[PDB]
Amino acid sequence: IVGGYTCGANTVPYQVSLNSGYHFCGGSLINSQWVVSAAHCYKSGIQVRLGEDNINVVEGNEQFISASKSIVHPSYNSNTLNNDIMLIKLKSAASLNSRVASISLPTSCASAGTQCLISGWGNTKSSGTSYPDVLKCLKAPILSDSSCKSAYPGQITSNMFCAGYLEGGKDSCQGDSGGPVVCSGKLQGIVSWGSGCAQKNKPGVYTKVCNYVSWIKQTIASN
């Protein structure tokens, strides 16, 4: 997260860190046994880390649970990043509490101008590299589809939306991928891609979760 602020320990209780020896992506807890992340985050050997603030210090509210199954969306397109969404089932049910909590899925899509909360442990520099230990947060509005397509000609699909600031300076970044965009208490986005981070006229691009609710529910019900 570039241009954001320190969330505060466990203030984003649905935020997860995916760990394969180190933090490599974010995710969102949607029930006690399932996490949503980005398909491009897929790898083997995932441990889901819930209840994290400082990812380099055990502070006493963490739950570390290995993945039992990963399911990349059947239509994930690694060329275009269309359908950049994955589900991860936990080997055991997390214990839900005030610091480890699920985020509701949307029942309808969100509209341009709605303010959302974007969070993660990704890079905090738009030029250079600095990775934080504690969770960072950014409030950012959804941009119109027209503005998104204007910023990224020929690259925006019906399963993507932009959020952020055309002036630059505030954005998600590498290491935030797979993490949440939450608007009015619903998970509307997954950190997916962009051109650089926090650059002028290059807002963040996010997977449009509202298009996947039926697939998420049916996949969870059958697995």
Q: Give the binding site for Ca ion (CB under 5 A).
A: 52, 54, 59
> Least distance in Å: CB of 52 to Ca ion?
5
**84: annotated active-site residue:** yes
**How far apart are the C-alpha atoms of 221 and 200, rounded to whole Å?**
42
40 is catalytic: yes
Say whether 17 counts as a known binding-site residue.
no
Catalytic residue among 23, 40, 176, 192: 40
Residue number, 51 or 106, with CB nearest to Ca ion: 51
To the question of whether residue 175 is assigned a binding role by annotation, the answer is: yes
Toward Ca ion, which CB reaches closer, 60 or 154?
A: 60
The response to whether 172 counts as a known ligand-binding position is: yes
Closer residue to Ca ion in complex, CB, 62/84? 62
From 84, 119, 176, 192, the catalytic residue? 84
Our CB check for Ca ion shows the closer of 52 and 171 to be 52
| Cβ neighbours for 101, distance < 8 A, ≥ 6 positions apart | 13, 14, 29
177 is in an annotated binding site: yes
Minimum distance from residue 13 beta carbon to Ca ion (Å): 14
The least distance separating Ca ion from the CB of residue 136, rounded to whole angstroms, comes to 15
133 flagged as catalytic: no
52 is in an annotated binding site: yes
Rounded to a whole number of angstroms, the minimum distance from the CB of residue 92 to Ca ion is 19
DSSP string, the chain: -BS-EE--TTSSTTEEEEESSSEEEEEEEEETTEEEE-GGG--SS-EEEES-SSTTS--S--EEEEEEEEEE-TT--TTT-TT--EEEEESS----BTTB---BPPSS---TT-EEEEEES----SSS----SS-EEEEEEBPPHHHHHHHSTTT--TTEEEES-TT-S-B--TT-TT-EEEETTEEEEEEEE-SSSSBTTB-EEEEEGGGGHHHHHHHHHH-
Q: Which residue ranges are tagged as binding site for substrate?
A: 171-172, 174-175, 177
Q: Tell me which residues are annotated as active site.
A: 40, 84, 177
Q: Which residue ranges are tagged as binding site?
A: 52, 54, 57, 62, 171-172, 174-175, 177
